[PDB]
Symmetry: D2
Subunit: 260 residues, 4 copies
């Protein structure tokens, strides 16, 4: 009998034991929640399917957020088994590698722009809609993952910064849209973490080593600390919070100027 006794949650974005979604799932399950998972993509099906099976779950559905049908079908299918859900976790972001390697101006093409904002920003709004029925029944909450590159320039984050900034604006509009129906909408601004979202990024732990020295706590966060924070936001303890962007970066965002 944990904090999430009898509560259910959908987790989109588990790619490996390292994804931010995994640390979330572990924290939720650790507290008694029942879990469901999506995969983009059946390259990933087998790994996700009973990757679910550490979590007492078999509920594994295909969901590529580029296709409108895949979204609603995944929620109609997931509708078949579950009344509703007390939360939907959005841990999805993507942009064409080339748009994240070089000068922002030179490498940001129109297509690379479309995919970035499409996969990483609109997806959250689409899922929210297809999930609204399941969420009103249970007056669950929504949660997405953002990054403070939306508010500040980081080298090579480029169009992803614009996408995250759009995402963050969405959370606020979703919170007013769904707030009347008792559905809370929030996001976590996590510090940089070495996950599969770092593959192909040459600067990465040079970024990791910089964050380690600048963050007031002198360390980089983990998927556990992110999971624990996401757990709180998906819980009745966070019942008074909506449209909030919680920074889980060891306070990195608060430093103007460190001892070089």
């Amino acid at each position: 009998q944990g904090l999430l006794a009898g509560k259910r949650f959908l987790i989109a974005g588990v790619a490996s034991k390292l994804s931010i979604a995994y640390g979330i799932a572990q924290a939720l399950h650790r507290e008694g929640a029942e879990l469901a998972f999506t995969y983009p993509n059946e390259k990933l099906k087998k790994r996700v399917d009973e990757f679910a099976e550490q979590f007492g779950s078999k509920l594994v559905f295909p969901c590529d957020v580029a296709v409108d049908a895949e979204i609603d079908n995944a929620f109609a299918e997931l509708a078949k088994h579950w009344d509703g859900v007390d939360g939907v976790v959005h841990s999805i972001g993507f942009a064409p590698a080339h748009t994240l390697d070089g000068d922002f101006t030179d490498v940001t093409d129109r297509d690379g722009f479309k995919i970035a904002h499409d996969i990483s920003a609109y997806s959250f709004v689409a899922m929210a809609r297809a999930a609204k029925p399941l969420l009103q029944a249970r007056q669950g909450c929504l949660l997405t993952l953002t990054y403070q590159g939306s508010e500040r320039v980081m080298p090579n984050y480029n169009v992803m910064g614009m996408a995250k900034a759009s995402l963050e604006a969405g959370v606020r509009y979703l919170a007013s849209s769904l707030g009347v129906d008792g559905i809370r909408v929030n996001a976590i601004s996590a510090g940089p973490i070495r996950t599969l979202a770092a593959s192909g990024i040459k600067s990465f732990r040079k970024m990791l080593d910089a964050n380690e020295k600048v963050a007031p706590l002198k360390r980089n966060v983990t998927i556990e600390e992110v999971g624990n924070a996401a757990l709180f936001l998906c819980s009745p303890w966070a019942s008074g919070i909506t449209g909030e962007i919680l920074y889980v970066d060891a306070g990195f965002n608060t430093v103007g100027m460190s001892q070089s």
Copy 2:
């Protein structure tokens, strides 16, 4: 005047109520002279004349949905002008239906794509196609956003996300082009009745609320925005880049007004 001999491109003049027209008017007031784009044949006719009331020809096709039209637009302008001291981006668009109803219900994928494409990417594309022409004279870039990116306004919906993406662009552009001495800034203008108000049922009632909340108890004008944009396109703004300047009579500063 202050802008003696400097040149500026003005994209987004649709009518005499333009955010861009009032700015363009302010730019000319100080002696700079001007070039203009139009989205299609429609607006070709109206822009041609708006150019000639400011002593200008420089009137080129630019639908920001087409990549070619953009680069051609900066290629045409190369023939006439050595360089450019600034580019003014006053363009935004969404299916409108995405701006009428509940945010969740009415925000489809296409309406999202169009919103961010026309309203957010365009500035970055123009910035690129304009980079060479802008390096010649160490010009600057300027766009108009809306504080719906930070705060929820009813029926602004997907435009809020786009403007938020836009504002992030300004910062990355300013960091990218800053080494080139090219400044990148934006103006967050208060709401004002322009052709960007057609089809919005709540508008003036939005206008009447802003009139009561703004510390100054009034709504800004296209002139006041023009004057501010004039500064940002001027050497007086040489120390400012990646800045979002709020021209809303301070509305952005109130948490809540007397009922």
Copy 3:
């Protein structure tokens, strides 16, 4: 055996069963923490004495934050039973009634400014210092209560906005100063709540009813929801968060304007 098993916390600012500190204390106790209490003077003595005896505590010490000595003595006294401490909760704010009733320019005198910033802003920094040793022992955390009047203009809040804005800057400098020692520093920006901090403020109901109409969730927060959030920030689940201003206002802060 709850989440705060064996953890102790100092609660500053319990004036009544409605105090924000009270909702905090209850949530901390709800999870098994041991509690300590301060009171500003005798008139306030009995209330903390019995408010402590409701959380299994008698540790009740006088602390008026206007006097330097009272602060350090309270922590020298509070030392007397406890080896160390896992957290200090700071829920204190005050300004001369007159300073908060009328035009900001006309009514903001120098002293009223002085008392405002002294009692409501510096106090947190002073307590933090006198609490540093006891906080290093257990690598505890610090928490204070703020209000979004620092960022945004509310009528009749006046100098309290400036003070809370100074407070919020303190959290960031404390978090950077004390973050090196593994001690986290964060604050909660709570929505308006009718407590004894509403006495003498006539606009409250139009305040409460307005926030109720604007907040995405269509309602005003409670000391329970604030307590629960503070509980999280004072817990290892918030180990990855420092220098954060957490908004507990039902998302009110995210609305630019609602159908007024």
Copy 4:
């Protein structure tokens, strides 16, 4: 016949030819503005008298902002010379050297806090009040100088950050208070610069070189750019802007951090 033909302005805070106020004064005068100046005490009299007459002005009044009387008297004096005023420039900040040299927690005493917030934050609100009548005559504007240490932690800036955070909140409440009367209130957040406010700061030069490396423009601002920008804010071109914090830092504030 410049932009400020026939316009009048009060300038508080000219300490030397390096003062931020000095480059401001130069910019306003360059455009035809009427100028006035204050000095904190006798020692500085000779130099302020001399700077005024380099701008064709003698309007130089004693004003130490620690004393209430000196403020109103200084504005009582200038009531005598000028019908009204089109703007008041506030370029004053100060804190006890010791509070700006060392760990924030260790060196921030209550007094150093009191003086810091008193001289640097309340002064603007007091001046604003004493200036209201003359400012209503011509509905001029108010302007102060802030620093982004209010949002972000700068080493050794300490209590000055909290004061500037209070200052910035003041601008918003002043703008809301005085906006109805047509008086605009704004502030400039200037990049760091070697002025008389750099004496006694050992890290300054390393700070100057860091901003030069991080700022998108790869350089530090000058009093030219600060003077010119405030000139706008004191001008009818800025008639649609109030309660605004304009950053003149070569974009430094927008970087999360550049190439190492």
